[PDB]
Design an enzyme around this catalytic site. Sequence first.
Site, PDB file in Angstrom:
ATOM      1  CG  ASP A   1       2.910   1.983   6.080  1.00  0.00           C
ATOM      2  OD1 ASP A   1       2.991   2.114   7.584  1.00  0.00           O
ATOM      3  OD2 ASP A   1       2.731   3.025   5.321  1.00  0.00           O
TER       4      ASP A   1
ATOM      5  CG  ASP B   1      -8.510  -3.985  -4.801  1.00  0.00           C
ATOM      6  OD1 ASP B   1      -7.613  -4.371  -3.772  1.00  0.00           O
ATOM      7  OD2 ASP B   1      -9.657  -3.975  -5.051  1.00  0.00           O
TER       8      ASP B   1
ATOM      9  CE  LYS C   1       5.473   4.035   6.967  1.00  0.00           C
ATOM     10  NZ  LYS C   1       4.378   4.762   6.440  1.00  0.00           N
TER      11      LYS C   1
ATOM     12  CB  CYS D   1      -0.549   6.015  10.521  1.00  0.00           C
ATOM     13  SG  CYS D   1      -1.229   5.844   9.209  1.00  0.00           S
TER      14      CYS D   1
ATOM     15  CG  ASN E   1      -4.170   7.004   6.164  1.00  0.00           C
ATOM     16  OD1 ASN E   1      -3.803   5.963   5.724  1.00  0.00           O
ATOM     17  ND2 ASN E   1      -3.277   7.909   6.602  1.00  0.00           N
TER      18      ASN E   1
ATOM     19  CB  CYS F   1      -0.897  -0.067   1.285  1.00  0.00           C
ATOM     20  SG  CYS F   1      -1.814  -1.674   1.479  1.00  0.00           S
ATOM     21  CB  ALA F   2       3.486   1.939  -2.284  1.00  0.00           C
TER      22      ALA F   2
END
Length: 258
Positions: free
Chosen positions: A155, A134, A89, A196, A161, A83-84
């Site tokens: 991540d 996806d 990262k 997060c 978010n 999940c970039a």
Amino acid sequence: KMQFIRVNTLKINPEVLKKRLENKGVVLEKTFLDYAFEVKKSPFSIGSTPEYLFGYYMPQSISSMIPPIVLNPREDDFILDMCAAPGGKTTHLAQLMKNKGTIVAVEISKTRTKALKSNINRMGVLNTIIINADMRKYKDYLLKNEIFFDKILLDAPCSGNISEEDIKYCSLRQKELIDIGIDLLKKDGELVYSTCSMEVEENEEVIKYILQKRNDVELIIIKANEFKGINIKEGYIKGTLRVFPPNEPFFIAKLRKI
Ligand SMILES: Nc1ncnc2c1ncn2[C@@H]1O[C@H](C[C@@H](N)CC[C@H](N)C(=O)O)[C@@H](O)[C@H]1O
């Protein structure tokens, strides 16, 4: 709230960048990393300097610099970043790999894929293949074709978010993603789960879920002691880590396929 920058050793040496910014009135403080600095004062919006635009650094929480460090990819590894976007990262992993090997960087949103590609091009990253898809469907492609990875960063998006519902929704997603990540790992390969959010539903719940769901996974113990100066402690599963205020809220764990 604190501000930090990661120096992009792909492009520049820490001390060269540090001297250049201090001569423009930036006050920088050491970090537990020789290539990350705390910004104490800046006459500049830190995402706004010619240095930033040149790819000399990435602004980001220090908390968010831990997952790539714990996954610790090697130079020639084949890596999945599930999940970039925006690529904080992803470019960190590339710097750690010195632009060798391969990172497959996957992002569901088309718009966010833009920001990801921008960060990557800006930071001069060359070992990365951007997939706008996806993950939950892209993984059938990877599985059908036997495309397994040495190390995987999951991540995952987090409640923050964007409530009890937000948290429950994210937790479910995270549980889906982590099962997928284990499926895509070579035997003896390593996945870092981070997020997060310091909420246990997004944290040790997701870890406890994957350990009970599967027989082919082993928790690797991570220690806080390395992460000097960060409000980081052990999770409620031994060997997992939670970051607290005044650091950015975060959770990190690490698994091994057996
Ligand atoms: N199924 C999915 N496939 C790909 N990306 C996803 C999926 N679900 C959520 N995402 C993305 O997960 C991301 C959430 C971020 N916390 C990731 C931050 C990023 N890893 C960085 O360090 O900069 C958002 O970019 C979402 O668009």
